[PDB]
Structure formats: C-alpha cells, structure tokens
Amino acid sequence: TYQRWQFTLPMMSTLYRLANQLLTDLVDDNYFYLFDLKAFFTSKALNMAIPGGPKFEPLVRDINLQDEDWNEFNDINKIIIRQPIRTEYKIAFPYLYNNLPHHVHLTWYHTPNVVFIKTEDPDLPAFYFDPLINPISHRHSVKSQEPLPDDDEEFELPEFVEPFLKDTPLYTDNTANGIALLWAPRPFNLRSGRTRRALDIPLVKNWYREHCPAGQPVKVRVSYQKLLKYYVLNALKHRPPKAQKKRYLFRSFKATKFFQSTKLDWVEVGLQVCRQGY
Amino acid sequence: KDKSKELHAIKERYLRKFVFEWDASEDTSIDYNPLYKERHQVQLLGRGFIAGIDLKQQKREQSRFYGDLMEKRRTLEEKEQEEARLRKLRKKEAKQRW
Amino acid sequence: YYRFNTGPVGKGPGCGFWAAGWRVWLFFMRGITPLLERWLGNLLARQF
Amino acid sequence: MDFLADLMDNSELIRNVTLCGHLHHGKTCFVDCLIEQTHPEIRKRYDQDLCYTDILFTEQERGVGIKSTPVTVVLPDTKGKSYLFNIMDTPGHVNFSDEVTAGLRISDGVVLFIDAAEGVMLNTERLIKHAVQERLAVTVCINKIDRLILELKLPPTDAYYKLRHIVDEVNGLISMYSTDENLILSPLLGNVCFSSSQYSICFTLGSFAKIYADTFGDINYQEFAKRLWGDIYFNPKTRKFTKKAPTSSSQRSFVEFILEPLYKILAQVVGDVDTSLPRTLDELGIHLTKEELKLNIRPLLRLVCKKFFGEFTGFVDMCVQHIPSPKVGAKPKIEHTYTGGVDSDLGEAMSDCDPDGPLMCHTTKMYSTDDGVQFHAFGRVLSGTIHAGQPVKVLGENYTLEDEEDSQICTVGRLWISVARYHIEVNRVPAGNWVLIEGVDQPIVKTATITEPRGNEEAQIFRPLKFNTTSVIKIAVEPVNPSELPKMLDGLRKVNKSYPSLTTKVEESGEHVILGTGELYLDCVMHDLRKMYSEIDIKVADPVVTFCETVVETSSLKCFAETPNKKNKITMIAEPLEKGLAEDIENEVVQITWNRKKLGEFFQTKYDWDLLAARSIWAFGPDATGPNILVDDTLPSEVDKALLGSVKDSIVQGFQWGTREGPLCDELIRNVKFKILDAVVAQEPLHRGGGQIIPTARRVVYSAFLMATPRLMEPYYFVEVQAPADCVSAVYTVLARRRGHVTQDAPIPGSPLYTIKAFIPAIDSFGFETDLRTHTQGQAFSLSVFHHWQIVPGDPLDKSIVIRPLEPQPAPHLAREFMIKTRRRKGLSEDVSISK
Amino acid sequence: IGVPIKVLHEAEGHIVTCETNTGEVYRGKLIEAEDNMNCQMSNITVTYRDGRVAQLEQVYIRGSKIRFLILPDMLKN
C-alpha cells in the first residue's frame, strides 16, 4: 500500500541536511507577516492590493464605495495626513483604516520570535553558549538580599537519593540533529505520517510564498505576483461536496473481462500509448 | 519626486488578441516609500539561506554583520576552533575544485 | 531558471526542474480529460 | 462536582488571583493546561492549543486575547487539599492591559508571568509597577522554560544564570516600585514558579523536592527546597548543601538536581526515539504505550512532561503560600478600593468578610450574552450573599450621598458564578467570591457597586476605576445611512459598557468620537461593534490624537471678567507650571483633600514654593489630578477674602470647566499655574449670581492662556521595539521616517534579540508598528504605550501659511494647522479670537 | 499518603470537632492539620467528660491522645 511511513529522527536529520538547498531558512511565521493567505484574502476582498500582492478584479462594481461625495466630516479640509495610509495599514487593521470593510478576513497578529540557533559545526557541543547570544552580567553580588539557608547544620540527604537522571549523557550526538528538526518546515517537522502523491508536492510553493526574491528584474516580480494570484484564487474556492461511493471505475475496468493485467517497462507502455493514440 | 509621489498617492486615495506571455504593466511592487521599497533582507543573523540563492554567493552576499560580531565575541579558544573549521572547509573546497 | 542560474551556474539554458510545470500540466490534463472522454464516447456511440 | 459549590462556602479556601502576561499566548497556554488538568474531558489538539481563555472569536482568529476571561476551578495541592482557584486571565497587549486594570480590583493577588527567553518586557514592567501601586501580592512565573532548554539550547549553567538574572531584574523592579519588606522573591522564598506552559511542565523547588521524595527516600521536601533553590552548592562527600562550594567542578544545587534532569529528559525525547528508549523511560519511572511512542516529537514530549511532572501542584502550593484568602486579604482591598474608609461600620464589617452581614458587591467587568442583546455584570462580592431574585440597589461609579437618584433598584436573576464550564446553575454566592450578576446591567455602565436595598442607608460605592494607560487615539463614527442611526448608537452603548478603556463622547459637532489607547484596541472595538453590537455598516474617519494646550511664558497682562450683576470683576494671570510638577501631581502624589499644612510642607520642601502661595486655595484641575493647578493668590489685604470663601466653589467649578475645555481646540490643558490675582465683588448675595462666575471664570482662563505663550502638546508614546541585532540600525531608520527619537537601546541578556526604547509622537505613531514589521520583512516587533505629553513645535495662534489639503506641513507650522483643524472638527469657531 | 490523613488535611480551615481519648471534645476551626493527625486550632470550645465547657484561644492536640474527629459534610462531595 505504501501509504504510511514510520521513520526515525536521524533520517529526518539527514534528509533535512540534503534538502536545505530547496528549503528556505525561515522558521517563524512572522516572516509571512502580510503574505499569509488571510492577508491576500482581505486584499482581494477590497480594491486595494499590497505592493507585494497581486491585483484583482473586484467582486462587485462597488460604486457606493468608489467615489463618495464630500460630507461634513469626510471633508479632506479637516482630515490631517501625517503619513500616507498605505495598503499595509488597511490590510493590517481592516476594521479600522477601511470605511465599510464588509466581507473581509482576519489576519494573525503576531507569533513569539523563534529564538533558535542553527548548528554550525557538528563536533562542537550542542548545549554551548553561542557567541551570537548576548552575554549576561556575571555580577559577583556579595550582598545577600536573597534568603540563605543554614551553614552545615541541616539538609541531611540520603546517599541513595541520586539527582534523578544520572549516568546518562546530558549532551549526545543526536541532540543537535533533533533540536534542529524540531524547528523544520512542515514536511520535516513530522516524525512519521502518511504519504502524498508525486504530483501534489509543490516544491516551488515555498518560494513565491516568501516576501520577494530580492534583486530580481521586473518580469520576475510580475511572474511571482501572477502565480500568487493563481494560488490565492485556488485557495479561495476549496470545498468538496464530493461524498462519493468510492466506485473505483479504474478497478472495475481492470476486473472487466475485456481487459487483462500484465507487467512491462514504462517506456514500453509509453510507446503502446503512442501507437494507441495514433 | 518622492514628495510629489506621496502627493498623488494621497490624491488617488482621497480624490482574440492572443498574448504569448505575461506583460510588465501588471507589476504592483512599485512603491515610492523608500522604507517599503527598500526592505531589509531577513538574513536571520547569518542564518538566512534562501533556497534558490547560491550558497557561496549568499555567503558573499551576506552583510557579514553577524559574522563580524561573532568573530569579535568569540574567545581565543573559539577563534582557534573557528579557524580550524574554516581551514578544513577550505581543504574540502579545494578537494571538490580539484 | 532565475534560481538555477542564481550564482556560479551559467545564465544559459541549463536548467532542470521540470516537476514544477509537470504537475501543472498533469492537473490541467486531469481537468480536461472528462471532455475528451465524453466526446470520444459520443463518437463511439450511434447518436453522434 | 458539588464540591465546587461546597468549597465556595469556606471563605478561607478561596484564592482570588489575576494573571498577567508578556503576550496573551503564554498566559492562556497556562490557563488551558490548568483547565485540562482540572477537566479531563477537554484535551488540547496536537495541531493547536485549545486556548479556553479566548472566548471571543476575534481573539481566536487574530491570535491575541481580547477580553479577560475569569475562569478557573478547584485545584489540588501536594501538601494541601483542593482550593477553589478563580483566575482572571488577562490579555498580553500594552493597550489591552487596560482591561487587566479591571482585574486589579477583581482580586488582591497578581501571578505575574515572564517569558524565560524573552525576559522582562515593557508590558510586564508596567503591570508589575501597577500591581505594586495597587497593593497586591506578586508571585512570578518563569514562562516558556522550554525555550531556554530547546529553542536556545543554552548550557544548563548558563540557563540557570539567565533565570537568576531575570529573577534579580524582577526583584529590582519590584523594590524600585514598592519599599515593602515582602518584595523578596525567590524559589527559596516561594515567589517564583518555573512553568513553561508548554508540554505541561510546571514546578517549583518544593515540587521538585516532593518528586524526589516520591521517587525514593523520605527527605523532607521543605528543607530540600529551601536548600536546592539557590546557588548554595552541593557536596557529595559531605552529601549536603555546602555554601562554601567545596567541590571544584560541581554545579549549583538547582543546576545539578533540578535543571539537569529536565535537560536530560528533553535531550532524550527530542534527540531520538532510541535516546528516549524504554530503558530511559523505566529509569525515569514511566511506561508509555506504543501508541504514545508513535506520536510526533512535540506530542511525545508533551505527554512525557505532563506525566512526569504531576498536575501543576507546585503552582497551587506557591499560590496558597503567598496569595491570601479573601478573609485575610479583604482588609487591604477595603482600605484601597473603598472611598468610604475602612473605619466605617459597614466598611469594618466588609473588612471581616462576613457573609451574613450587609451585601456589598462591586461589579466592574461587563460580559455580553451569546445573543448579545443583554449583558451581565461580573464583580466580586466583598460582603453579603447575593440571591437569585433578590432586589438590590446598584449605585453607579458616579453615585454619591448628595443625590440618591444616581442609583437604581433592580432584580438579580441567575448568577452563573461558575465560569469554567460557563454554566448558570449557581443560585446564591457567598461573600468574597466573584458573581456574574444578571439583570442589573442596564442601570450601570461600568465599575458600579450593588448593595442591599434597605439593610444599609449610608453605604457608598467604591472608588472609581483608574487606569495606567490614557486613551489618546480618537476616531469618529458615522452610519452609512442615517436612517438607522439609533441602532448603531445602541451598539455604541454596548461598546461603552463592554470596554472600560473605550470612551464614547457625543461631540458638539454631531460626531460620535471613540477614544482608545492603541490602534489594535480601536480595531477590535470596531470589529466588535460591527459584528456583534451593531450589525449596521459604519463609516469612520482617519485616526486622530487628542491634543493638549500648554504654556511656556508668563502672561503679559492681567485678564479680568466682570459678572453681569453690578459689574463684579475678577482679574487673574496665568503662568506656566514649575518643571516636573505635572507628572508629580498626575501621579496622585498630592491630593487637594490633603491638609493645608502637609501640602505647604510638601511644596516648600520639594518645589520650594512660597508658604503663602501654598496656603492659597488650590484647585489642581478636575478631581485634584489635573496638571493645570489653580492657586488663589488674592492679597489678604483686600476685603474679598470673605467673598472668595463665599465664591471658592464657583471659582473651582469655573477652573475645572476651563481645564476640561480650553480656548484652543477646547481640549484638555495641562501644566498651567493659574494664579487668581484678585476679585472685586459686592458682598450682597443677590449680586453673587452662581451662573455669572463660571462663564466669567472660563473667559478669564481663555484670556490668560492667550495672554501667556500658548503651545500645542502631543502624546509621545513609549515603544519597546524588540528586534534582531542586524535590523537594529534599520529599526532606527524607521524612527527616522516617523519623526521618532531613540531613548535607549540594549541587547537582551541571554537572548540574541535586542530591545530599543523609543519615544514616537502619536501623530506619526499610527501604523508605526506596521511600518517597522514590514520594513524589517516580518522580523522586528513593536509595542507602543502612551508615555508623556510633549510640547509640539510652532505656535497654535501664530499666523502661518495654510497647509495643502493633502501634504504634510513643515515642523514650525504643525501647531497652527493642528489647532485650526481641531477647532473646526470639534464644531467650534475655527479662527482664534484674542478678544474672545 | 493515606485517604483518611488526606481527608483530614483537606478538612483544615473549616469547623470540625474532635473527641480525644480522655473524653474532652474540642470543636473549632482546624488551622493546621499534620500528617500524624496532630491538629492545631484557634478559638476552639472544649467540653470535658464531667460537663464543664470552656473556650481556648489557641490549642494544639496530638493524635496519640485523640479518639475520633468529625468534619463537615462539604468534604463528602
């Protein structure tokens, strides 16, 4: 059946090592600040499109919100604009910076900053104070404002009481690999799961979902924006009513007496199909 | 130009024929705001490695701020270990280029 | 191609990542094939 | 489950506690872990946390908690029985912390939370300072302990040093805020609980000692916790806590016996399935099933930590040790919250927390029903027992003994005191327990006290609720079409009751202005208004900042206004307030109710003011908190001293009215030392018309402000923008664009991140966080809270060039165009008249 | 960790009575409950076997001279 796979941590470590080339180094969802599907949803639900986001055809004419007449408070003579109200402001807070927001989506506000250090040299121990980590004040603090216990007068502990986990290496060779896998992208975060088909594994998917391939010609931008538009339109309409009866028509055709089964090379099958099409 | 750009931006805010491929007239990334136009690339403090960007080029294209800070903060033993690691990496690179 | 030729790789035609368009063509063919099957059945029948 | 109601009767088994958080995710994770421990039916999904404290759908979708959730249950203890914990989880946002201010009066104990990796934050420091000023117990919780263990992968000794540094910083902040001897906080003292809130890993020193005793031996857990908490070191040869540190290569007791086992378990679990082998599990005394082993790394670690570390007994023990029962803790709360004094007989009875005494319940929280038509007033019952159907008089926040019409009688339906299951099976609730009174929502807006109808005839409501943050962002509200204007207005009222921080004001220009603290705050306000409180589509305006009017120079000439009755004229001169007096007075340091001798001594010592000036009649703005102070410097040689005494109330009313509505933009005015020069008035009471003074007083105030040098003032917001080191300089660039000034910048101790404290003007603060996050490509994060009023450049009334309708004005011209736009938008005359 | 000792420790803080082996019955609020049944109470009423009753401001009775103890009905649920 080859449907579910149960594997081990080192295999994920080595596969992630090999696939680092095709996988971005982003680990925190805050990088997809205004490029997550909800931001594009609320951009499409409005006329305004973010500079990194594709344009869209408005759902309705929306002539009511197109050019409203000047009102007593809507007059620009009273509104003060210190900074332009860019599309970022509208997408971030659709219910505040947008008159008549109507049917919109809600975007995630924030995720705690992933404070992770990627392993640089395997030989060096994992539980090591990396130089990038800021130093802390190792103050002597001869003062004793904190409470202090008795001096060699109490706390008689039995010798059979060990500090629990003992005779076990605190740092092992596999600690770095596992702790790196713990912050892997979606495919490698799972220790073991179910298979997916070959054709529905989009490798380039994580690429355009990034903010931008910085340092690119205009045509690259246009291609990225258009393909993001296609992806977001695919994401919008996604509901299966298909409560099928699991009638495997292909299996029934296989069971039909008019056809038989055999084994052959793929190239032979290809030439057979070419002859059949001719 | 930037002041006039903001001016007309605020004004806009308030006041068959087969085609072979896409056209550049649909680009939306053109924003006059220099902060938005020039966005600081997220290098993850020396840990940002984009997929398609060449690893060696990315190391060259890296701002080296994190690398320089780590070199300054590294102790003598840490500096020696880093020197040995980079020497081994250079030997490996020479082996591949051979 | 942009990524393949990102660095030391030449700016020539040497790019080999067909899967990205292969999946799109597979999906479009999967969408199309109902029409071709229906018309081929219409021809194969007598009420063409 | 009847024991939940049974334990409510025991007034000594209740632990009224409110939570705080750097971010709402951390506190709500802990609350969800507590709920899962108490309620075995609800189990958090592997994909996402349950987040039972996020009742609102807005918080669930946005990810940031919106409204405080007062939900908890009876929880057991290692050395004690189950106590009925009731915890009001609070949002983890700087602006939303204003809602947590309500919880300040809900309970008398704050179990503060601090992230291990993030460390101290601006929200955490502000909450700690506010709690210290609120006279409540503080028990710190090191949150996200797994971040140091897993995310940072720091060495165990380095992790212990970082935790000790965080604890020391918290203790220093507490000592700076309050001088009480109980400020000592440490695992040995029992004020620090290490609770990652992820994988259900929570403990204290006592919890670890109890685990050790259960595993093997019979060591006294209290002594072991008292010894292993600090850096007292352990000698194996002596086999005892040896403060002299005899062993050369030994690690501290906490690092050796507490942090090290957790690190070993985490390394075994995350490192490999063979690392967390069944042999290792047996050595740890746990036998997980094959199904539990087949799970992913995160669920396996969560299950292992939950099974190994009990059921959060250490947190319960720490809370019981320090957070007092309502009977013990009611007396300080009676002294602080009650404006009637604890010396009152009813106040004294409430201080004893007598269920059979008078009924005195203070409701400050407001919660909407599922249908949204009706509300429910949530509040603590300080004294008495409320019964379903029993009528009660709900004295409002503005109620006073002068007028009895300020209170109304209403019936109380079902109580729904229990909130963990959100059920309404409660019939009556004793004193000291939180009650969700139903049916009395209409007479009261927010922070109102209900009382028995006829039992007491002199009991008054508690002091009005106060907030640390100040609502400075104002936004106009209009309907899409006026045809259903009242319906929206209905929702507007539902907004005023629901959010205490939000202020709805009907401006004279026919505009409904909502005042809030932060941009996200007002966005949530509008989302709740449109989706729930008023389905009508609502049009808004560009956000505006409430402005202040100040003085820089003394008045050139005196200004006098004559009362119509026989030309009784009062003359005055206004002068700028002494530097540093504004924040001192605004911090409730000195009140007008203080004795004259005490105020004179304070002014002579601190600000070296003249004793005669101090002895003058002092106003100090509205409610004695307005920075604009008024001193009646009228010469005693004049015969108007008796007249001044007979007109002191009218003068004070005129001054407070002028403070509320100034001459420019009619906004609040601060740091104005209004000196009442003199007044000549006929002694006849007929000539002393009450309505002839206040308009004259405000005219004098306006003329004096015009006579003195006028300046505009904008609220500079403090922002503690945390960002990675590489972007730090770029972060300053953002402040460069938005007219921001960097106040300080320090690296995060033990974390690669870097905090920058900056002072961004409110005019450019709108969307500043969005600019910072987008420009830094989603790396930097910010959080802005109003800090202090700063004088805007330019002159409000100087004839300057009119700015373009859609172009930012130059810095010298900001004040005049701000003033003209505010005056026109408010509906008053735009042009400022010197004669007026 | 016994069930009766845990029920006696959980019953601390409420009104309960305790009849000792000498016939003296002390009723009051259980301030502290030990593991060996040593109960320290404050403001209790002690009635002897002869019928004389008295009030004590604070007492601490050990479990060795204690016969039985009766707690409230709230601990049954």
Two tokens at D188? 């040995």
Residue identified by tokens 């780590």 is: B70
Two tokens at D288? 């997980």
Two tokens at D65? 């908690």
- Please, where are the H alpha helices in B15-75? 34-37, 55-61, 65-73
Note down the domain range covering E20: 1-77
Check if the beta carbon of residue D255 is closer than 8 Å to that of residue D156.
yes
Indicate the SS3 state at residue D95.
coil
Two tokens at D666? 């009619």
Element (H, E) at D486: helix D485-498
Q: What is the CA radius of gyration of chain C?
A: 20
In 3D space, the residue among D747, D821, D758, D803 whose CA is nearest the CA of residue D784 turns out to be: D758
As to burial, measured by CB atoms within 10 angstroms (0-12 exposed, 13-18 middle, 19+ buried), residue B30 is exposed
Check if the beta carbon of residue D67 is closer than 8 Å to that of residue D55.
yes
| Beta-bridge mates of residue D436 | D378
Report the alpha-carbon angle D43-D45-D48, nearest 5: 130
D817 C-beta neighbours (distance < 10 Å), count: 19
| DSSP one-letter code for D256 | I
Check if the beta carbon of residue A82 is closer than 8 Å to that of residue D760.
no
Residue D475, chain A, CB below 8 Å: the answer is yes
Give Cα D815 to chain centroid, integer Å. Answer: 32
Question: Which region, left, alpha or beta, applies to residue B81 given φ > 0 means left and ψ of -120 to 50 means alpha?
Answer: alpha
Chains that touch A (3 or more CB pairs under 8 A): B, C, D
Give Cα D786 to chain centroid, integer Å. Answer: 13
Instruction: Say yes or no for a CB contact (<8 Å) between A204 and C27.
Output: no
Check if the beta carbon of residue D447 is closer than 8 Å to that of residue D399.
no
| Beta-bridge mates of residue A35 | none
Q: D533: Cβ–Cβ under 8 A, 6 or more apart, which residues?
A: D368, D372, D490, D491, D492, D494, D495, D498
CA–CA distance, A110 with E63 (Å, rounded to integer)? 58
Pairing verdict, β D568-576 and D672-680: antiparallel
Indicate the SS3 state at residue D533.
helix
Give the CA count within 13 Å in the CB-facing half-sphere of D798: 13
Interface of C with A in 9-48 (CB under 8 A): 17, 19-20, 22-23, 26-27
CA–CA distance, A131 with A116 (Å, rounded to integer)? 13
Report the binding-site residues of D for GTP. Answer: 21-28, 89-93, 143-146
* Resolution stated for this PDB structure, in Å: 5.8
Q: At what angle do helices D648-660 and D694-707 cross, to 10 degrees?
A: 50
φ, ψ at D436 (rounded to 5°): -100, 75
Instruction: Say yes or no for a CB contact (<8 Å) between A199 and C20.
Output: no
Which of the residues B54, B61, B96, B97 would you substitute to probe the C interface, choosing the one with the greatest number of C C-beta atoms within 10 Å? B54
Two tokens at D54? 């996020």
CA–CA distance, D127 with D101 (Å, rounded to integer)? 9
Instruction: Say yes or no for a CB contact (<8 Å) between B49 and A24.
Output: yes
Strands (E) across D358-511 are located at 360-368, 375-383, 386-387, 391-395, 407-411, 428-429, 434-438, 448-451, 473-479, 503-506
Check if the beta carbon of residue A12 is closer than 8 Å to that of residue A200.
no
Q: Give the C-alpha distances (Å, rounded to integers) separating D456 from D358, D367, D423, D459.
A: 7, 28, 32, 6
Nearest to B36 among D775, D806, D807 (CB): D775
D255 C-beta neighbours (distance < 10 Å), count: 23
Two tokens at C47? 């009420």
CA–CA distance, D670 with D705 (Å, rounded to integer)? 11
CA–CA distance, E26 with E44 (Å, rounded to integer)? 6
Search chain A and give the residue with CA nearest D169. A137
* Angstroms from B18 CA to nearest CA on chain D: 38
In 3D space, the residue among B51, D380, D44, D81 whose CA is nearest the CA of residue A203 turns out to be: B51
CA–CA distance, D183 with D199 (Å, rounded to integer)? 31
Rounded-to-10 torsion of CA D311, D315, D321, D324: -110
Instruction: Say yes or no for a CB contact (<8 Å) between A73 and D217.
Output: no
- Please, where are the H alpha helices in E1-77? 3-10
Strands (E) across chain A are located at 4-6, 192-194
Q: A51: Cβ–Cβ under 8 A, 6 or more apart, which residues?
A: A87, B28, B29, B30, B31, B36
How many residues appear in chain E?
A: 77
CA–CA distance, D399 with D362 (Å, rounded to integer)? 13
Instruction: Say yes or no for a CB contact (<8 Å) between B54 and C9.
Output: yes
Which CATH number covers residue E28? 2.30.30.100
Search chain C and give the residue with CA nearest A202. C20
Pairing verdict, β E39-47 and D512-516: unpaired
Instruction: Say yes or no for a CB contact (<8 Å) between D10 and E12.
Output: no
Residue type for position D605 = T
| Count of domains observed in chain E | 1
Pairing verdict, β D192-195 and D140-143: parallel
Q: D262: Cβ–Cβ under 8 A, 6 or more apart, which residues?
A: D145, D149, D201
| DSSP one-letter code for A30 | G
Q: Give the C-alpha distances (Å, rounded to integers) separating D530 from C4, D65, D534, D668.
A: 50, 19, 5, 30
| Beta-bridge mates of residue D115 | D119, D143
CA–CA distance, D82 with D87 (Å, rounded to integer)? 15
DSSP state string for D126-189: HHHHHHHHTT-EE-EEEE-HHIIIIIS---HHHHHHHHHHHHHHHHHHHHHH---GGG---TTT
CA–CA distance, B44 with B66 (Å, rounded to integer)? 9
Two tokens at D725? 């080191």
Check if the beta carbon of residue A91 is closer than 8 Å to that of residue A42.
yes
CA–CA distance, B79 with B68 (Å, rounded to integer)? 12
